[PDB]
Amino acid sequence: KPPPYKHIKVNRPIGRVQIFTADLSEIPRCNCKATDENPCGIDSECINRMLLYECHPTVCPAGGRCQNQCFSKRQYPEVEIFRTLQRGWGLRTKTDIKKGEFVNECVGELIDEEECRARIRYAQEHDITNFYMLTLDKDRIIDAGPKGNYARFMNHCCQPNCETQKWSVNGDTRVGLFALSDIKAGTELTFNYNLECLGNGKTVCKCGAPNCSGFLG
Numbered sequence: 737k738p739p740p741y742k743h744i745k746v747n748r749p750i751g752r753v754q755i756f757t758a759d760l761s762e763i764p765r766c767n768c769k770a771t772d773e774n775p776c777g778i779d780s781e782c783i784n785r786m787l788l789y790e791c792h793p794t795v796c797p798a799g800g801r802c803q804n805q806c807f808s809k810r811q812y813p814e815v816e817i818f819r820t821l822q823r824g825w826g827l828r829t830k831t832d833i834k835k836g837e838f839v840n841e842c843v844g845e846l847i848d849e850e851e852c853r854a855r856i857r858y859a860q861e862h863d864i865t866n867f868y869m870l871t872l873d874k875d876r877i878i879d880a881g882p883k884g885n886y887a888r889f890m891n892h893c894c895q896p897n898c899e900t901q902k903w904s905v906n907g908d909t910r911v912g913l914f915a916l917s918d919i920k921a922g923t924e925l926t927f928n929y930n931l932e933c934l935g936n937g938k939t940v941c942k943c944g945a946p947n948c949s950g951f952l953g
């Protein structure tokens with residue numbers, strides 16, 4: 737059984753950490769029509785989607801059928817946690833996911849470098865080998881360990897089927913997972929941690945890909 741965690745829907749800023757807000761002047765304005773085949777969708781000419789911005793619902797001309805509100809809408813593909821051989825607990829999809837489709841948001845407690853330094857330090861001193869830390873920016877780190885969602889079970893892979901993207905939503909950064917290719921129902925959902933994830937120093941990569949570098953990210 738996986739150790740408990742508080743299931744949260746949005747990022748939770750801790751201590752000095754701030755969650756900022758901008759106006760409509762700091763957001764592009766697309767010209768997608770309600771009559772388009774997939775208004776503001778994965779293959780459209782939506783200037784907001786292209787610049788990694790969501791559309792503002794009350795001003796998007798595509799209106800009600802705007803397809804560029806994936807973070808705000810929190811509609812994720814059906815997933816489940818399962819027991820992997822060597823990388824502990826993992827996350828697999830229960831439904832087919834298409835290339836470029838939104839998979840999840842990396843949601844956790846938003847912490848600063850001082851709080852992140854104390855939590856790695858405690859984990860190191862107490863032989864904790866599982867980390868759920870992801871850089872939002874130089875000032876803010878997502879920690880999905882105490883509080884999070886299903887994204888926290890997604891393992892690293894040198895040949896992943898997902899990627900992270902830094903999007904602007906309501907005037908602040910959010911981290912989302914998007915499919916790098918079509919993913920079949922039953923497959924483990926992975927992403928390359930790259931330099932984004934903290935604490936995994938001397939961790940040996942067990943992704944088992946033919947192009948494995950031996951290290952996490």
Ligand SMILES: C[S@@+](CC[C@H](N)C(=O)[O-])C[C@H]1O[C@@H](n2cnc3c(N)ncnc32)[C@H](O)[C@@H]1O
Pocket residue numbers: 738822823824825826865866867868888889890891892893936939940941942943952
């Ligand atoms: C975000 S958690 C992923 C869920 C985790 N496997 C669990 O059981 O809760 C990442 C942690 O899982 C382990 N891990 C993830 N991907 C791995 C990989 N490719 N090779 C080895 N360990 C991995 C590491 O201990 C890492 O700190």
Ligand SMILES: [Ca+2]
Pocket residue numbers: 765766767768776784791792795796797798802804
């Ligand atoms: Ca729009």
Ligand SMILES: [Ca+2]
Pocket residue numbers: 764765766784791792795796797
């Ligand atoms: Ca818009």
Ligand SMILES: [Zn+2]
Pocket residue numbers: 766767768775776777781782783784791798804
């Ligand atoms: Zn659009």
Ligand SMILES: [Zn+2]
Pocket residue numbers: 766768775776791796797798799802803804
């Ligand atoms: Zn739109």
Ligand SMILES: [Zn+2]
Pocket residue numbers: 893894895941942943944945947948949950951
């Ligand atoms: Zn690997």
